[PDB]
Design an enzyme around this catalytic site. Structure first.
Site, mmCIF file in Angstrom:
data_model
loop_
_atom_site.group_PDB
_atom_site.id
_atom_site.type_symbol
_atom_site.label_atom_id
_atom_site.label_comp_id
_atom_site.label_asym_id
_atom_site.label_seq_id
_atom_site.Cartn_x
_atom_site.Cartn_y
_atom_site.Cartn_z
ATOM 1 N N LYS A 181 -78.040 61.087 -2.373
ATOM 2 C CA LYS A 181 -77.241 60.399 -3.376
ATOM 3 C C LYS A 181 -77.416 61.036 -4.744
ATOM 4 O O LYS A 181 -78.479 61.568 -5.081
ATOM 5 C CB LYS A 181 -77.605 58.918 -3.463
ATOM 6 C CG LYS A 181 -76.427 58.043 -3.894
ATOM 7 C CD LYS A 181 -76.619 56.585 -3.532
ATOM 8 C CE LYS A 181 -76.762 55.711 -4.756
ATOM 9 N NZ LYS A 181 -76.736 54.272 -4.375
ATOM 10 N N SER A 202 -72.160 51.523 -3.728
ATOM 11 C CA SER A 202 -72.665 52.636 -4.527
ATOM 12 C C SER A 202 -73.005 53.844 -3.651
ATOM 13 O O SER A 202 -72.812 54.992 -4.065
ATOM 14 C CB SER A 202 -73.893 52.189 -5.319
ATOM 15 O OG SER A 202 -73.725 50.853 -5.772
ATOM 16 N N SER A 215 -75.823 47.770 -1.265
ATOM 17 C CA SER A 215 -75.218 49.091 -1.371
ATOM 18 C C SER A 215 -75.632 50.052 -0.262
ATOM 19 O O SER A 215 -74.995 51.097 -0.096
ATOM 20 C CB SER A 215 -75.556 49.717 -2.711
ATOM 21 O OG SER A 215 -74.581 50.686 -2.990
#
Lengths: 407, 423
Positions: free
Chosen positions: B75, B144, B168
């Site tokens: 991420k 997210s 998320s």
């Protein structure tokens, strides 16, 4: 010499002795030695012996436990079902804890017999030196092999050192606090605070630690084939007796002979001035504050733990005094006024809290291990501090240190 | 089907394939699938292939690692040395991180190669765009971490890592029919990862977690990144004892999701499990939900909230966790929807509660957030598992929730759940 906790479990497991006999032998030890030092506030003899008898009925069925049949005592702040946790207040004598603390349940599920609870002194001539002082005195007497305590300002480590016994201050949050009433705490489950085992040897400490912990703990590890150690004798505005500084220097030489590297100075040393300030402030909140003040203290505590993490990229453990002095005389002076004498120099007593803060503020594990005896004969103990969650590394290094010091 | 991470490490370990070869195949896999998806926004290809070569040099002399030579992406919020971390539309694009985040250091020591970073779409993105749900273009990735889940659904990379505060990790994994694990709070180090939200430092309730296509890759990643070891799966009895939590306060569940859970419970019953619809020991969701929404608004903050409110909010969650502790004295796991709905089409304006419709009936959106909160507020571990696909073909995923520090129990029950559903 009194047998260790794990040695007792082996004998009861062997059938050489029985849990009832070991429990009864313990109360004989407590009644003989206790009048003179008043180590245990509460006595639960008769339920303990019925608890013992029930255990031998289960050893008959083949039930086995890691601490099988071990007589034990705990600090009074722990909740035992059917007994008060008075904390020296008469009004609180009325009340009884309904159920055991989680730590107590895990220990009795491990086969311990809880004979009684031990006096908590406020933070013969010599002092016990701590809230868990009754605990250290109980094991120093040889009454019981195993005990448990609480640490916010060194109440586990400092009493152990004063009485020449072992104590472990665990990584924060791994041993469950519930059922333990933290002494002198503005907020229940107060931050920085931990419960910990006390014992006469390192193996008993580790055994109790793994039984009570919420999750498993990784075994001892080192960066390299040899120990890499940092001495931390100089702390901001804190003075250490020469006898302790000497005892640490001799232990360092013996470690070097065996092949360890023992550094006196490191550039990666965390900022202790910034560290101590936060500990003093957090202690005031722990012993009207803004939300933002409280939040910024957590930021400081997060960034101090990051600095120690970076230091522990190079070092396995840090060795430090538990506190600047050996056991000190009774003093009724108010603590801010409280003056202490270090090698003929009067000093503020407050300044000494820097040493327990070394581990407590970053949340690091610390093992308090006896390494020496003072000129007057007071025991000298030091703390072995390890990285977060490396409690078993700290115990391993403390075990090595103790073999070297007493060789 | 794309190989798993642990399978990949096995091949590199065996000598069947080389670390350079695995990274190259992934890089080719990303170029084929990424233009139509926009999953990976940052690419580190050329430093990545030198890492693979350097790793193969170390394999050339008895170097072994549990995730040896596994190509992966991370991420964008995680810090990778030499790479930018945006921090939410700061325009920090000029800057590069000096050091890897702790999770990244631990993965690389385990032998992973990080090809690139993945888009972070906004929580329920300007700097990089929007990632389309790997199944349906109009529908959302859902979190997210949506960029991470889309990379695994496409098959670019076997392993990925994400962050979860409001579901998320779990929701994007479920929406894209892939796995995610939201661990017990505080076991995986957050340092070097920037969390959405105003509050400085790691927010309470907030965690980083792995994402993968199977449970074993999840467990492997968890044990590598975690600060301490985690106990293995344990059950009260020889059989699974499970509680369904399909009904949440003022929360509505699509029928296809409700049906998929019923069928899984039936198959669990077939194996000998006890699967209860209701329990008296259920900690009341009402109070639990009461604390949860406000802490989400509390974390989105610094009238200045008082210290005493924050103290009482912590006091509320502690004794809710105690209630969940009592429930898990009876049950090994709780099975619940990740969220009341399957993937939903994006909404141009997010009026609060406007978007949600359940079974043809308009519903408040806020209410669906009760499902992610079920785990988050008590700090419990929860595994997100694909168990179905709805009539439109959207994947159905659910949460497996376990007691504190029992992440491996959740993964094990999730391991069983997906095997039963897809056999």
């Amino acid at each position: 010499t009194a047998p260790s906790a794990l040695a007792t479990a082996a004998a009861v497991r062997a059938g050489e002795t029985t849990a009832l006999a070991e429990t009864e032998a313990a109360i004989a030890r407590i009644e003989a030695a206790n009048p003179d030092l008043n180590a245990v506030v509460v006595k639960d003899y008769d339920r303990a012996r019925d608890a013992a008898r029930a255990l031998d009925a289960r050893i008959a069925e083949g039930f086995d436990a890691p601490l099988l049949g071990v007589p034990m005592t705990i600090k009074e702040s722990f909740n035992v079902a059917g007994l008060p946790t008075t904390f020296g207040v008469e009004q609180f004598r009325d009340f009884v804890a309904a159920e055991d603390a989680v730590a107590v349940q895990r220990l009795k599920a491990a086969g311990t017999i809880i004979l009684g609870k031990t006096n908590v002194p406020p933070r013969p001539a010599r002092v016990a030196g701590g809230s868990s002082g009754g605990s250290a005195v109980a094991l120093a007497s040889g009454m019981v092999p195993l005990e448990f305590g609480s640490d916010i300002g060194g109440s586990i480590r400092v009493p152990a050192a004063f009485n020449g016994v072992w104590g472990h201050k665990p990584t924060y949050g791994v041993l469950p606090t519930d059922g333990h009433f933290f002494p002198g705490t503005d907020f229940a489950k107060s931050v920085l605070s931990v419960i910990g085992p006390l014992a006469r040897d390192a193996d008993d400490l580790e055994a109790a630690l793994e039984i009570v912990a919420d999750h498993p703990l990784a075994p001892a590890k080192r960066h390299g084939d040899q120990w890499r150690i940092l001495l931390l004798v100089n702390a901001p505005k804190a003075k250490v007796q020469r006898a302790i500084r000497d005892a640490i220097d001799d232990l360092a030489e013996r470690f070097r002979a065996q092949g360890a590297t023992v550094d006196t100075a490191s550039d990666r040393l965390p900022d202790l001035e910034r560290q101590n300030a936060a500990y003093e402030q957090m202690l005031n909140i722990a012993m009207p504050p803004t939300l933002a003040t409280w939040l910024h203290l957590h930021d400081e505590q997060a960034r101090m733990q990051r600095q120690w993490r970076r230091l522990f990229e190079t070092y396995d453990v840090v060795i430090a005094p538990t506190v600047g002095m050996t056991a000190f005389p009774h003093d009724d002076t108010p603590l801010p006024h409280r003056r202490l004498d270090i090698d003929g120099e009067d000093t503020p007593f407050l300044h000494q809290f820097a040493f327990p803060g070394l581990a407590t503020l970053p949340m690091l594990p610390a093992t308090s291990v006896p390494i020496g005896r003072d000129g007057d004969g007071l025991p000298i103990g030091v703390q072995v501090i390890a990285d977060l969650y490396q409690d078993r590394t700290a115990l391993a290094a403390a075990r090595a240190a103790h073999a070297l010091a007493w060789s």
